[PDB]
Write an enzyme that holds these catalytic residues in place. Structure first.
Site, PDB file in Angstrom:
ATOM      1  N   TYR A  17     -26.115 -19.142 -41.108  1.00  0.00           N
ATOM      2  CA  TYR A  17     -27.030 -19.564 -40.058  1.00  0.00           C
ATOM      3  C   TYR A  17     -27.708 -20.886 -40.419  1.00  0.00           C
ATOM      4  O   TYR A  17     -27.975 -21.704 -39.542  1.00  0.00           O
ATOM      5  CB  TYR A  17     -28.045 -18.459 -39.757  1.00  0.00           C
ATOM      6  CG  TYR A  17     -27.422 -17.319 -38.968  1.00  0.00           C
ATOM      7  CD1 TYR A  17     -26.775 -17.562 -37.751  1.00  0.00           C
ATOM      8  CD2 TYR A  17     -27.474 -16.008 -39.429  1.00  0.00           C
ATOM      9  CE1 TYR A  17     -26.197 -16.527 -37.013  1.00  0.00           C
ATOM     10  CE2 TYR A  17     -26.898 -14.963 -38.696  1.00  0.00           C
ATOM     11  CZ  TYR A  17     -26.265 -15.231 -37.492  1.00  0.00           C
ATOM     12  OH  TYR A  17     -25.719 -14.200 -36.762  1.00  0.00           O
TER      13      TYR A  17
ATOM     14  N   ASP B  22     -17.761  -8.293 -40.597  1.00  0.00           N
ATOM     15  CA  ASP B  22     -18.476  -7.638 -41.687  1.00  0.00           C
ATOM     16  C   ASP B  22     -19.343  -6.510 -41.132  1.00  0.00           C
ATOM     17  O   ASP B  22     -19.419  -5.425 -41.708  1.00  0.00           O
ATOM     18  CB  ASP B  22     -19.390  -8.622 -42.422  1.00  0.00           C
ATOM     19  CG  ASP B  22     -18.623  -9.627 -43.254  1.00  0.00           C
ATOM     20  OD1 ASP B  22     -17.558  -9.258 -43.787  1.00  0.00           O
ATOM     21  OD2 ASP B  22     -19.092 -10.777 -43.389  1.00  0.00           O
TER      22      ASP B  22
END
Ligand SMILES: [Fe+3]
Ligand SMILES: [Fe+3]
Ligand SMILES: [Fe+3]
Ligand SMILES: [Fe+3]
Ligand SMILES: [Hg+2]
Ligand SMILES: [Hg+2]
Ligand SMILES: [Hg+2]
Ligand SMILES: [Hg+2]
Ligand SMILES: [Hg+2]
Ligand SMILES: [Hg+2]
Ligand SMILES: [Hg+2]
Ligand SMILES: [Hg+2]
Ligand SMILES: [Hg+2]
Ligand SMILES: [Hg+2]
Ligand SMILES: [O]
Ligand SMILES: [O]
Lengths: 340, 340
Positions: free
Chosen positions: B122, B237
């Site tokens: 991010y 994930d």
């Protein structure tokens, strides 16, 4: 008083490494100390998978080894496993709750993760050289000789963890818990953390390298090549780990971080010194068990004791401590081949 | 009390997942619950690095976007970033002190590590689209519309952590701390754990998936494709993460791991049910803030609320809870192109 997300908007560049406001947002566009961001990047670039390493030849080599050499190899491996198991969980449980800057928080979690990888690499080896891994693993728990050399490591972590819990729950001051007077001093907690860091430095920078030497003594014989490749990969990670603690410690010492920490470092430098001396003596005492059934050509108690004094002096000087042992040359220069 | 290395030789195959004897030896040649070792293996094989993903065109896409769309994209991103920040540290600090089987201990550490990779990604995205990250990162901490779910989420974790410390320091019973009575019950602690777990399942199985939808809508329009590639890896994930909590919860409620837990879960099923509905409702309300200045192609208030209800039903049924919403088919079949 611990929180998984502090609502206070704070400047993470001004917080100390430890004991400041718990980290909120995990950002990596900036850092107070970029050395930790560099360590994360480096550790990530070193990513390796244990199960990929071929150790099919190790079973043959191991079984072909004389009983006393198998004893040396297996005792050393069981010790590495012990420390690895502890290093996988402790950084997270003991340090993570005390970190107040994002780069250090993530470094510790990355560091802890790489430790579980090492533990997994050991299962991979044990599983492929012995009929029943349970005998090796169970023996690790029992066997006084092994717990004798590691004595002090888990207990120190446990004490730091306990004191931390009291601090978070009760805050600083003198309290009354079930009729007992319990003192909670932030200054005392800081010293416990400081000294825990010194101990982890001694652990990774000294204890593990002595074990690397024992492992590579076999590699030098063209034996246990699978294990050797794994040790090389592990040692590569360990170099980053000890680099991290050396930096945490020297930065605290400089007075550029928490001012109280620089005072603490100075104040208890004799404790730091004593910690290394005791750690060194423990590695030496371990030699009596390691070579109980006999030694190997270029690997015995004398050579191991000389290496301990050698590496200890180097590690202690790297964190500014006086040297306890007489200076000497590398008693085993052949290890450079396997390191770096 | 907690210890980083329990000296008692025990059978890790017979210990319960939580509250049993702390894990000593980290071994991976066997496990009580196979699922955790498989998740560790899968997560390791999915290893990726954010920096390697090309996000060079996202800055231009972001700038050209209409103001309300920029609002939608950045608000969504800030929420995901908030959640990853929490997920990076919380599983370790909250669950590690309570785990009693090795495969679960390492899974949590691997799961946590995986979350720090997401946080790093991010930062990678934010740095390549605003060129002034601080504005984005600070708003995460104080944004009122965001800091509502964060509070509740961090609250479950924090309370579990606090009660865990009291249990470790004082044990069960009625105690006194500075003139106040403090009760510690293992039953209540087990309930809190069951509650963080259910909340974490909703966080990863519902909250994040709604955000994935918010993100892939841009990708469907061939915009913010750098961001999209990263979200695909993250969602990949996440499937493992929710699978992990689903198994933890089902094993705890079935009574195969701890009869008392099965008993406890049956008692607070209504609470859990409401906990799930509340989460879904918070995600719904977020729509008013997200589309306050207008919606976009294939994405709006009504669509999002439909997806929230569709996803919530699936997740709740997966953990044995009743369905709170009217059944329906996927309102946005196209999302399956980026998920599974
Ligand atoms: Fe290690
Ligand atoms: Fe290490
Ligand atoms: Fe995540
Ligand atoms: Fe996740
Ligand atoms: Hg320590
Ligand atoms: Hg050695
Ligand atoms: Hg001191
Ligand atoms: Hg010192
Ligand atoms: Hg010596
Ligand atoms: Hg939670
Ligand atoms: Hg959405
Ligand atoms: Hg419940
Ligand atoms: Hg719930
Ligand atoms: Hg809805
Ligand atoms: O390590
Ligand atoms: O995730």
């Amino acid at each position: 008083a611990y929180t998984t997300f502090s609502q206070t908007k704070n400047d993470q560049l001004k917080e100390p490494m430890f004991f400041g406001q718990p980290v909120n947002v995990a950002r990596y566009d900036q850092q107070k100390y970029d050395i930790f961001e560099k360590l994360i990047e480096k550790q990530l670039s070193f990513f390796w998978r244990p199960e990929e390493v071929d150790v099919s030849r190790d079973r043959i080599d191991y079984q072909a080894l004389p009983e006393h050499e198998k004893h040396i190899f297996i005792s050393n491996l069981k010790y590495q496993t012990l420390l690895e198991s502890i290093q996988g969980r402790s950084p997270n449980v003991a340090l993570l709750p005390l970190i107040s800057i994002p780069e250090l928080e993530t470094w510790v979690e990355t560091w802890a993760f790489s430790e579980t990888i090492h533990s997994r690499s050991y299962t991979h080896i044990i599983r492929n050289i012995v009929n029943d891994p349970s005998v090796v693993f169970d023996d690790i728990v029992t066997n006084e000789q092994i717990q004798k050399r590691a004595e002090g490591i888990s207990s120190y972590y446990d004490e730091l963890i306990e004191m931390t819990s009291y601090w978070h729950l009760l805050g600083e001051g003198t309290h009354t818990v079930n009729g007992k007077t319990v003192t909670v001093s932030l200054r005392e907690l800081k010293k416990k953390l400081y000294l825990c860091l010194m101990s982890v430095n001694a652990l990774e920078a000294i204890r593990f390298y002595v074990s690397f030497a024992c492992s590579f003594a076999f590699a030098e014989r063209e034996l246990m090549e699978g294990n050797a490749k794994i040790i090389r990969l592990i040692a590569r990670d360990e170099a980053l780990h000890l680099t991290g603690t050396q930096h945490m410690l020297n930065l605290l010492r400089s007075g550029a971080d928490d001012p109280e920490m620089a005072e603490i470092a100075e104040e208890c430098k004799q404790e730091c010194y004593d910690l290394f001396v005791q750690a060194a003596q423990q590695e030496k005492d371990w030699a009596d068990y390691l070579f109980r059934d006999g030694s190997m050509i270029g690997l015995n108690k004398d050579i191991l004791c000389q290496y301990v004094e050698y590496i200890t002096n180097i590690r202690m000087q790297a964190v500014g401590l006086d040297l306890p042992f007489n200076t000497r040359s590398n008693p085993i220069p052949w290890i450079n081949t396997w390191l770096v």
